[PDB]
Amino acid sequence: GHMKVKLSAKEILEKEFKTGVRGYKQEDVDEFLDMIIKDYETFHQEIEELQQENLQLKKQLE
Amino acid sequence: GHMKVKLSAKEILEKEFKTGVRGYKQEDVDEFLDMIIKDYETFHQEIEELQQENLQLKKQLEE
Ligand SMILES: [Zn+2]
Ligand SMILES: [Zn+2]
Ligand SMILES: [Zn+2]
Ligand SMILES: [Zn+2]
Ligand SMILES: [Zn+2]
Ligand SMILES: [Zn+2]
Ligand SMILES: [Zn+2]
Ligand SMILES: [Zn+2]
């Protein structure tokens, strides 16, 4: 069966964190989250491609 | 297209960030990273399941 993730690329782009003393440097976190966002986009695109292919194969077999 | 994935759950665990006098609250960033690590695992399992399912259906169509 299909398994869903918790977050999306847009939710990570738009997440706001509160601040505090000795918090993590914002640019360090944001640059790393940007790499994560691109991975979410890559994962989502490949799943979309694999699920459309899965639907086509199941249709030929029906 | 291809699977040009940049990071792994282990790389996310190992990543360190410099701190500032102020910055993003560490608790909140770390707990968000935990959710992300769990999603990388889910994405992987979903892709593996679809790849093997599609292989099996392709083979059956021709055998
Ligand atoms: Zn499943
Ligand atoms: Zn499946
Ligand atoms: Zn799925
Ligand atoms: Zn930088
Ligand atoms: Zn989509
Ligand atoms: Zn692909
Ligand atoms: Zn270190
Ligand atoms: Zn894999």
Short mmCIF file of N, CA, C and O and ligand atoms in Angstrom, two decimals:
data_model
loop_
_atom_site.label_atom_id
_atom_site.label_comp_id
_atom_site.label_asym_id
_atom_site.label_seq_id
_atom_site.Cartn_x
_atom_site.Cartn_y
_atom_site.Cartn_z
N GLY A 1 0.77 -1.24 0.00
CA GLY A 1 0.00 0.00 0.00
C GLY A 1 0.81 1.30 0.00
O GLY A 1 1.98 1.32 0.35
N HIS A 2 0.12 2.39 -0.36
CA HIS A 2 0.70 3.72 -0.41
C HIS A 2 0.97 4.24 1.00
O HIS A 2 0.17 4.02 1.92
N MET A 3 2.11 4.88 1.16
CA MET A 3 2.56 5.43 2.43
C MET A 3 2.72 6.92 2.25
O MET A 3 3.36 7.36 1.29
N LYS A 4 2.17 7.69 3.17
CA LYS A 4 2.20 9.13 3.07
C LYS A 4 3.30 9.70 3.97
O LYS A 4 3.61 9.14 5.03
N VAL A 5 3.92 10.78 3.52
CA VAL A 5 4.86 11.51 4.38
C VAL A 5 4.14 12.57 5.22
O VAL A 5 2.98 12.90 4.96
N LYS A 6 4.86 13.15 6.19
CA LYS A 6 4.26 14.15 7.07
C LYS A 6 4.30 15.55 6.47
O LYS A 6 3.32 16.31 6.58
N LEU A 7 5.41 15.91 5.84
CA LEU A 7 5.68 17.26 5.34
C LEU A 7 5.69 17.33 3.83
O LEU A 7 5.76 16.34 3.11
N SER A 8 5.69 18.55 3.31
CA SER A 8 5.84 18.77 1.88
C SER A 8 6.97 19.75 1.63
O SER A 8 7.37 20.47 2.54
N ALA A 9 7.41 19.84 0.38
CA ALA A 9 8.41 20.86 0.03
C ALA A 9 7.95 22.26 0.45
O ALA A 9 8.73 23.04 1.03
N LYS A 10 6.67 22.61 0.17
CA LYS A 10 6.19 23.95 0.51
C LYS A 10 6.15 24.18 2.02
O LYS A 10 6.48 25.27 2.49
N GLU A 11 5.78 23.15 2.79
CA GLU A 11 5.73 23.31 4.24
C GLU A 11 7.12 23.56 4.81
O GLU A 11 7.26 24.31 5.78
N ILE A 12 8.15 22.95 4.22
CA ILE A 12 9.52 23.20 4.70
C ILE A 12 10.02 24.58 4.26
O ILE A 12 10.69 25.29 5.02
N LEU A 13 9.66 25.00 3.05
CA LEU A 13 10.01 26.35 2.60
C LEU A 13 9.44 27.39 3.54
O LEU A 13 10.11 28.39 3.84
N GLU A 14 8.23 27.18 4.02
CA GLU A 14 7.48 28.22 4.71
C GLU A 14 7.50 28.10 6.24
O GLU A 14 6.95 28.97 6.92
N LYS A 15 8.12 27.04 6.78
CA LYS A 15 8.19 26.86 8.22
C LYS A 15 8.86 28.05 8.85
O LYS A 15 9.95 28.47 8.43
N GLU A 16 8.25 28.59 9.90
CA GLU A 16 8.89 29.67 10.65
C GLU A 16 9.34 29.10 11.98
O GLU A 16 8.59 28.34 12.62
N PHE A 17 10.58 29.39 12.39
CA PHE A 17 11.05 28.96 13.71
C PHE A 17 11.14 30.17 14.62
O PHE A 17 11.63 31.20 14.20
N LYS A 18 10.74 30.00 15.87
CA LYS A 18 11.02 31.11 16.75
C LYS A 18 12.50 31.15 17.05
O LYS A 18 13.26 30.22 16.75
N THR A 19 12.91 32.26 17.64
CA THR A 19 14.33 32.46 17.95
C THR A 19 14.57 32.35 19.44
O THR A 19 13.64 32.28 20.27
N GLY A 20 15.88 32.36 19.77
CA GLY A 20 16.27 32.36 21.18
C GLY A 20 17.75 32.55 21.31
O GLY A 20 18.48 32.55 20.32
N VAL A 21 18.19 32.67 22.57
CA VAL A 21 19.63 32.85 22.85
C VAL A 21 20.39 31.59 22.40
O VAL A 21 19.97 30.44 22.61
N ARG A 22 21.56 31.82 21.80
CA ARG A 22 22.43 30.72 21.31
C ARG A 22 21.68 29.77 20.38
O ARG A 22 21.99 28.56 20.27
N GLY A 23 20.67 30.26 19.67
CA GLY A 23 20.05 29.46 18.65
C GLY A 23 21.00 29.21 17.47
O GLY A 23 22.08 29.77 17.30
N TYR A 24 20.55 28.29 16.61
CA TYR A 24 21.33 27.97 15.42
C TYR A 24 21.31 29.15 14.46
O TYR A 24 20.27 29.77 14.26
N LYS A 25 22.47 29.46 13.86
CA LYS A 25 22.59 30.53 12.89
C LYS A 25 21.58 30.34 11.78
O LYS A 25 21.52 29.27 11.19
N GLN A 26 20.81 31.38 11.50
CA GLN A 26 19.68 31.19 10.59
C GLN A 26 20.13 30.79 9.21
O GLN A 26 19.53 29.91 8.60
N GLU A 27 21.17 31.41 8.68
CA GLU A 27 21.53 31.07 7.32
C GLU A 27 21.99 29.63 7.23
O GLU A 27 21.76 29.01 6.19
N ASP A 28 22.69 29.12 8.26
CA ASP A 28 23.16 27.71 8.22
C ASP A 28 21.95 26.77 8.13
O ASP A 28 21.98 25.76 7.41
N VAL A 29 20.93 27.02 8.94
CA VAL A 29 19.74 26.18 8.90
C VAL A 29 19.03 26.34 7.56
O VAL A 29 18.61 25.35 6.92
N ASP A 30 18.86 27.58 7.11
CA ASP A 30 18.05 27.81 5.92
C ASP A 30 18.70 27.20 4.66
O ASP A 30 17.99 26.62 3.81
N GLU A 31 20.04 27.28 4.55
CA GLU A 31 20.75 26.72 3.40
C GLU A 31 20.62 25.20 3.40
O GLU A 31 20.55 24.58 2.33
N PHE A 32 20.61 24.60 4.57
CA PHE A 32 20.50 23.15 4.65
C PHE A 32 19.07 22.71 4.34
O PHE A 32 18.86 21.70 3.62
N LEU A 33 18.08 23.45 4.87
CA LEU A 33 16.70 23.16 4.53
C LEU A 33 16.46 23.34 3.04
O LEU A 33 15.65 22.60 2.47
N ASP A 34 17.19 24.25 2.38
CA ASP A 34 16.97 24.39 0.93
C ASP A 34 17.36 23.11 0.20
O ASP A 34 16.75 22.76 -0.81
N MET A 35 18.40 22.43 0.68
CA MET A 35 18.80 21.16 0.07
C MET A 35 17.75 20.10 0.31
O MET A 35 17.46 19.31 -0.58
N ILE A 36 17.19 20.08 1.53
CA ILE A 36 16.09 19.16 1.87
C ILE A 36 14.89 19.41 0.97
O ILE A 36 14.23 18.46 0.51
N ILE A 37 14.55 20.67 0.73
CA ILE A 37 13.40 20.99 -0.12
C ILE A 37 13.58 20.39 -1.50
O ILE A 37 12.65 19.79 -2.08
N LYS A 38 14.78 20.49 -2.06
CA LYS A 38 14.98 19.94 -3.40
C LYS A 38 14.84 18.43 -3.38
O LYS A 38 14.32 17.83 -4.33
N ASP A 39 15.29 17.78 -2.29
CA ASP A 39 15.09 16.32 -2.16
C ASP A 39 13.61 15.98 -2.06
O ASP A 39 13.14 15.02 -2.69
N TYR A 40 12.85 16.71 -1.26
CA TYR A 40 11.40 16.46 -1.26
C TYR A 40 10.82 16.57 -2.67
O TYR A 40 9.97 15.75 -3.05
N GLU A 41 11.24 17.58 -3.46
CA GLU A 41 10.73 17.72 -4.82
C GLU A 41 11.12 16.52 -5.68
O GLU A 41 10.29 15.99 -6.45
N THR A 42 12.37 16.03 -5.53
CA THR A 42 12.85 14.88 -6.30
C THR A 42 12.09 13.61 -5.92
O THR A 42 11.63 12.84 -6.80
N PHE A 43 11.90 13.38 -4.61
CA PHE A 43 11.18 12.21 -4.15
C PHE A 43 9.75 12.25 -4.66
O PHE A 43 9.24 11.24 -5.15
N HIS A 44 9.10 13.41 -4.54
CA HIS A 44 7.70 13.51 -4.93
C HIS A 44 7.54 13.27 -6.43
O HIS A 44 6.63 12.54 -6.87
N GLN A 45 8.44 13.84 -7.23
CA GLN A 45 8.40 13.63 -8.68
C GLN A 45 8.60 12.16 -9.04
O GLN A 45 7.92 11.65 -9.95
N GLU A 46 9.49 11.46 -8.35
CA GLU A 46 9.70 10.07 -8.77
C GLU A 46 8.53 9.20 -8.36
O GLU A 46 8.17 8.25 -9.07
N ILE A 47 7.95 9.47 -7.19
CA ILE A 47 6.75 8.73 -6.77
C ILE A 47 5.59 9.01 -7.72
O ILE A 47 4.83 8.10 -8.06
N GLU A 48 5.42 10.26 -8.17
CA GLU A 48 4.35 10.55 -9.13
C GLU A 48 4.52 9.74 -10.41
O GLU A 48 3.56 9.17 -10.96
N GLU A 49 5.77 9.64 -10.89
CA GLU A 49 6.11 8.89 -12.09
C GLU A 49 5.92 7.39 -11.87
O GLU A 49 5.35 6.70 -12.74
N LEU A 50 6.36 6.87 -10.73
CA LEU A 50 6.18 5.45 -10.47
C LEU A 50 4.72 5.12 -10.27
O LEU A 50 4.29 4.05 -10.67
N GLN A 51 3.93 6.00 -9.63
CA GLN A 51 2.51 5.64 -9.44
C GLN A 51 1.71 5.71 -10.75
O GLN A 51 0.81 4.89 -10.96
N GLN A 52 2.00 6.66 -11.63
CA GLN A 52 1.34 6.68 -12.93
C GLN A 52 1.70 5.44 -13.74
O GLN A 52 0.85 4.89 -14.44
N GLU A 53 2.95 4.97 -13.63
CA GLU A 53 3.35 3.76 -14.33
C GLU A 53 2.65 2.55 -13.74
O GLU A 53 2.17 1.69 -14.49
N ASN A 54 2.56 2.48 -12.41
CA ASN A 54 1.86 1.41 -11.71
C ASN A 54 0.40 1.32 -12.16
O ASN A 54 -0.12 0.23 -12.40
N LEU A 55 -0.27 2.48 -12.25
CA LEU A 55 -1.65 2.49 -12.75
C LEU A 55 -1.74 1.94 -14.16
O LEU A 55 -2.65 1.15 -14.48
N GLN A 56 -0.82 2.33 -15.04
CA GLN A 56 -0.86 1.84 -16.42
C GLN A 56 -0.66 0.32 -16.48
O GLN A 56 -1.37 -0.38 -17.22
N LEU A 57 0.30 -0.21 -15.71
CA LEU A 57 0.58 -1.65 -15.72
C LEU A 57 -0.61 -2.46 -15.20
O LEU A 57 -0.99 -3.50 -15.78
N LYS A 58 -1.21 -1.99 -14.10
CA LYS A 58 -2.39 -2.65 -13.55
C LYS A 58 -3.54 -2.61 -14.52
O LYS A 58 -4.36 -3.55 -14.56
N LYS A 59 -3.62 -1.55 -15.33
CA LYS A 59 -4.70 -1.50 -16.32
C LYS A 59 -4.49 -2.52 -17.43
O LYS A 59 -5.46 -3.17 -17.87
N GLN A 60 -3.26 -2.67 -17.94
CA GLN A 60 -3.03 -3.68 -18.97
C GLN A 60 -3.37 -5.08 -18.45
O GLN A 60 -3.89 -5.93 -19.20
N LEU A 61 -3.10 -5.34 -17.18
CA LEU A 61 -3.32 -6.65 -16.58
C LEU A 61 -4.79 -6.89 -16.27
O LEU A 61 -5.20 -8.05 -16.14
N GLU A 62 -5.59 -5.83 -16.18
CA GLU A 62 -7.03 -5.94 -16.12
C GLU A 62 -7.59 -6.00 -17.53
O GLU A 62 -8.64 -6.62 -17.73
N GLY B 1 12.36 11.32 -14.30
CA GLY B 1 13.79 11.58 -14.38
C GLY B 1 14.63 10.76 -13.42
O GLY B 1 14.19 9.73 -12.94
N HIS B 2 15.85 11.21 -13.13
CA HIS B 2 16.74 10.44 -12.26
C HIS B 2 16.45 10.74 -10.79
O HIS B 2 15.55 11.51 -10.43
N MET B 3 17.22 10.11 -9.91
CA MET B 3 17.08 10.30 -8.48
C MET B 3 18.34 10.97 -7.96
O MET B 3 19.16 10.35 -7.26
N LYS B 4 18.51 12.25 -8.32
CA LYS B 4 19.62 13.07 -7.83
C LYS B 4 19.30 13.64 -6.44
O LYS B 4 19.07 14.83 -6.24
N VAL B 5 19.31 12.74 -5.46
CA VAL B 5 19.04 13.08 -4.06
C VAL B 5 20.30 13.61 -3.38
O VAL B 5 21.40 13.08 -3.53
N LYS B 6 20.16 14.69 -2.64
CA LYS B 6 21.33 15.40 -2.10
C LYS B 6 21.78 14.86 -0.75
O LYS B 6 22.98 14.86 -0.45
N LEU B 7 20.84 14.43 0.08
CA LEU B 7 21.12 14.12 1.48
C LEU B 7 20.56 12.76 1.85
O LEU B 7 19.90 12.09 1.07
N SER B 8 20.90 12.32 3.05
CA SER B 8 20.47 11.05 3.59
C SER B 8 20.05 11.32 5.00
O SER B 8 20.41 12.35 5.56
N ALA B 9 19.30 10.41 5.58
CA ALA B 9 18.90 10.61 6.97
C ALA B 9 20.13 10.72 7.87
O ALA B 9 20.16 11.53 8.80
N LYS B 10 21.15 9.89 7.59
CA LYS B 10 22.38 9.95 8.40
C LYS B 10 23.06 11.33 8.27
O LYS B 10 23.55 11.88 9.27
N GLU B 11 23.11 11.91 7.06
CA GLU B 11 23.72 13.24 6.91
C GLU B 11 22.94 14.30 7.65
O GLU B 11 23.51 15.27 8.20
N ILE B 12 21.63 14.12 7.74
CA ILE B 12 20.84 15.09 8.49
C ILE B 12 21.10 14.97 9.99
O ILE B 12 21.25 15.95 10.71
N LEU B 13 21.20 13.75 10.49
CA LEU B 13 21.56 13.54 11.88
C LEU B 13 22.93 14.14 12.21
O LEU B 13 23.14 14.72 13.29
N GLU B 14 23.90 13.94 11.33
CA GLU B 14 25.28 14.36 11.62
C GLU B 14 25.51 15.87 11.44
O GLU B 14 26.47 16.40 12.03
N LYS B 15 24.65 16.58 10.69
CA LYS B 15 24.85 18.00 10.41
C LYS B 15 24.89 18.83 11.67
O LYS B 15 24.09 18.63 12.59
N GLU B 16 25.83 19.76 11.72
CA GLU B 16 25.94 20.69 12.83
C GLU B 16 25.74 22.08 12.30
O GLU B 16 26.03 22.36 11.14
N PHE B 17 25.17 22.94 13.13
CA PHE B 17 25.00 24.34 12.77
C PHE B 17 25.77 25.21 13.75
O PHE B 17 25.74 24.95 14.95
N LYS B 18 26.39 26.23 13.23
CA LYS B 18 26.97 27.23 14.14
C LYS B 18 25.86 27.89 14.95
O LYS B 18 24.72 27.97 14.49
N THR B 19 26.21 28.38 16.15
CA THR B 19 25.23 29.14 16.93
C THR B 19 25.59 30.60 16.86
O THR B 19 26.71 30.95 16.55
N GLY B 20 24.59 31.46 17.11
CA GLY B 20 24.84 32.89 17.22
C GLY B 20 24.46 33.36 18.61
O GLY B 20 23.97 32.59 19.44
N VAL B 21 24.73 34.63 18.88
CA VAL B 21 24.19 35.17 20.13
C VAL B 21 22.71 34.90 20.19
O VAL B 21 22.14 34.60 21.25
N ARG B 22 22.02 35.12 19.05
CA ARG B 22 20.66 34.62 18.82
C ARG B 22 20.63 33.78 17.56
O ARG B 22 21.46 33.96 16.64
N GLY B 23 19.63 32.93 17.50
CA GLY B 23 19.39 32.13 16.29
C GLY B 23 18.07 31.43 16.40
O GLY B 23 17.32 31.68 17.31
N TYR B 24 17.81 30.51 15.46
CA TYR B 24 16.58 29.71 15.58
C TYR B 24 16.65 28.79 16.80
O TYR B 24 17.68 28.17 17.12
N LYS B 25 15.54 28.68 17.51
CA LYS B 25 15.54 27.91 18.73
C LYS B 25 15.93 26.46 18.41
O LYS B 25 15.33 25.83 17.53
N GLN B 26 16.93 25.94 19.11
CA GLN B 26 17.46 24.63 18.71
C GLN B 26 16.43 23.51 18.84
O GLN B 26 16.39 22.58 18.01
N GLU B 27 15.62 23.55 19.90
CA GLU B 27 14.59 22.54 20.11
C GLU B 27 13.69 22.42 18.88
O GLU B 27 13.42 21.31 18.40
N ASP B 28 13.28 23.55 18.36
CA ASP B 28 12.29 23.59 17.29
C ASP B 28 12.89 23.11 15.98
O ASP B 28 12.22 22.38 15.21
N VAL B 29 14.12 23.53 15.69
CA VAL B 29 14.78 23.05 14.49
C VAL B 29 15.01 21.54 14.59
O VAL B 29 14.73 20.81 13.64
N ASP B 30 15.51 21.06 15.73
CA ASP B 30 15.83 19.63 15.83
C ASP B 30 14.56 18.78 15.68
O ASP B 30 14.58 17.69 15.09
N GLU B 31 13.45 19.23 16.29
CA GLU B 31 12.23 18.43 16.22
C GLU B 31 11.67 18.42 14.81
O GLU B 31 11.08 17.40 14.38
N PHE B 32 11.91 19.50 14.06
CA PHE B 32 11.49 19.53 12.65
C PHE B 32 12.36 18.60 11.82
O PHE B 32 11.84 17.87 10.96
N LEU B 33 13.67 18.58 12.11
CA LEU B 33 14.58 17.62 11.44
C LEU B 33 14.17 16.19 11.72
O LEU B 33 14.33 15.32 10.84
N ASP B 34 13.64 15.92 12.92
CA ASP B 34 13.23 14.53 13.23
C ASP B 34 12.12 14.12 12.30
O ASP B 34 12.11 12.99 11.82
N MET B 35 11.17 15.02 12.07
CA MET B 35 10.08 14.70 11.16
C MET B 35 10.59 14.44 9.76
O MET B 35 10.08 13.55 9.03
N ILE B 36 11.52 15.28 9.33
CA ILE B 36 12.15 15.17 8.02
C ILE B 36 12.85 13.80 7.88
O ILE B 36 12.74 13.15 6.84
N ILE B 37 13.68 13.41 8.85
CA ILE B 37 14.37 12.11 8.80
C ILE B 37 13.35 10.99 8.63
O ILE B 37 13.56 10.04 7.87
N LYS B 38 12.25 11.08 9.37
CA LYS B 38 11.23 10.05 9.26
C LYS B 38 10.61 10.04 7.86
O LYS B 38 10.35 8.94 7.29
N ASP B 39 10.45 11.21 7.24
CA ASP B 39 9.94 11.27 5.86
C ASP B 39 10.93 10.70 4.84
O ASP B 39 10.51 10.04 3.88
N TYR B 40 12.23 10.96 5.01
CA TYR B 40 13.19 10.34 4.08
C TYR B 40 13.03 8.82 4.09
O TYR B 40 13.12 8.19 3.04
N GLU B 41 12.82 8.23 5.26
CA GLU B 41 12.60 6.78 5.37
C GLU B 41 11.34 6.35 4.65
O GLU B 41 11.33 5.35 3.90
N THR B 42 10.25 7.09 4.86
CA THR B 42 8.99 6.81 4.18
C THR B 42 9.12 6.93 2.67
O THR B 42 8.70 6.02 1.94
N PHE B 43 9.69 8.03 2.18
CA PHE B 43 9.90 8.18 0.74
C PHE B 43 10.68 7.00 0.17
O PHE B 43 10.35 6.47 -0.90
N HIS B 44 11.74 6.59 0.86
CA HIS B 44 12.52 5.46 0.38
C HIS B 44 11.70 4.19 0.28
O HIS B 44 11.78 3.47 -0.71
N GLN B 45 10.92 3.90 1.31
CA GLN B 45 10.13 2.66 1.31
C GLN B 45 9.06 2.70 0.25
O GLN B 45 8.73 1.66 -0.35
N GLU B 46 8.49 3.88 0.02
CA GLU B 46 7.48 3.98 -1.02
C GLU B 46 8.08 3.76 -2.40
O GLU B 46 7.48 3.06 -3.24
N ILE B 47 9.24 4.37 -2.67
CA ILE B 47 9.90 4.20 -3.97
C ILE B 47 10.31 2.75 -4.16
O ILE B 47 10.12 2.17 -5.24
N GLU B 48 10.87 2.12 -3.13
CA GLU B 48 11.25 0.71 -3.26
C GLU B 48 10.03 -0.17 -3.53
O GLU B 48 10.09 -1.08 -4.38
N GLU B 49 8.92 0.07 -2.83
CA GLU B 49 7.72 -0.74 -3.04
C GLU B 49 7.20 -0.59 -4.47
O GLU B 49 6.88 -1.60 -5.12
N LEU B 50 7.15 0.63 -4.99
CA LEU B 50 6.65 0.85 -6.35
C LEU B 50 7.59 0.26 -7.40
O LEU B 50 7.15 -0.23 -8.46
N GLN B 51 8.89 0.34 -7.16
CA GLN B 51 9.81 -0.16 -8.16
C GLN B 51 9.70 -1.67 -8.26
O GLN B 51 9.73 -2.24 -9.36
N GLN B 52 9.52 -2.33 -7.12
CA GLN B 52 9.45 -3.79 -7.19
C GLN B 52 8.10 -4.24 -7.70
O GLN B 52 8.00 -5.20 -8.48
N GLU B 53 7.03 -3.55 -7.28
CA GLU B 53 5.70 -3.84 -7.79
C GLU B 53 5.65 -3.66 -9.30
O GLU B 53 5.10 -4.50 -10.01
N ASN B 54 6.22 -2.56 -9.81
CA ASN B 54 6.16 -2.32 -11.26
C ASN B 54 6.99 -3.34 -12.02
O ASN B 54 6.63 -3.75 -13.13
N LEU B 55 8.14 -3.74 -11.46
CA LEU B 55 8.93 -4.79 -12.08
C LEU B 55 8.12 -6.07 -12.19
O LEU B 55 8.13 -6.74 -13.23
N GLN B 56 7.43 -6.43 -11.11
CA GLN B 56 6.69 -7.67 -11.09
C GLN B 56 5.56 -7.64 -12.11
O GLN B 56 5.26 -8.66 -12.74
N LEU B 57 4.92 -6.47 -12.29
CA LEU B 57 3.79 -6.40 -13.22
C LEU B 57 4.28 -6.41 -14.66
O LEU B 57 3.62 -6.98 -15.55
N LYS B 58 5.42 -5.80 -14.91
CA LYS B 58 6.01 -5.83 -16.23
C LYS B 58 6.36 -7.25 -16.62
O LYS B 58 6.02 -7.70 -17.71
N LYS B 59 7.01 -7.99 -15.71
CA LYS B 59 7.37 -9.39 -15.99
C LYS B 59 6.14 -10.25 -16.26
O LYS B 59 6.16 -11.12 -17.13
N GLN B 60 5.08 -10.05 -15.50
CA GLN B 60 3.90 -10.87 -15.70
C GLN B 60 3.26 -10.58 -17.06
O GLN B 60 2.84 -11.51 -17.76
N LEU B 61 3.25 -9.31 -17.49
CA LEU B 61 2.66 -8.96 -18.78
C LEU B 61 3.31 -9.74 -19.91
O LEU B 61 2.65 -10.08 -20.90
N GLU B 62 4.59 -10.08 -19.76
CA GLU B 62 5.28 -10.75 -20.84
C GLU B 62 5.55 -12.22 -20.57
O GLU B 62 5.92 -12.94 -21.49
N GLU B 63 5.28 -12.72 -19.36
CA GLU B 63 5.46 -14.15 -19.04
C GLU B 63 4.14 -14.86 -18.67
O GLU B 63 3.31 -15.11 -19.53
ZN ZN C 1 2.61 -0.71 0.67
ZN ZN C 2 2.03 -0.46 -3.71
ZN ZN C 3 2.31 5.49 -3.18
ZN ZN C 4 26.16 30.10 3.80
ZN ZN C 5 2.12 15.64 -6.74
ZN ZN C 6 12.31 8.81 -12.86
ZN ZN C 7 31.09 17.99 15.23
ZN ZN C 8 16.20 2.36 -2.64
#
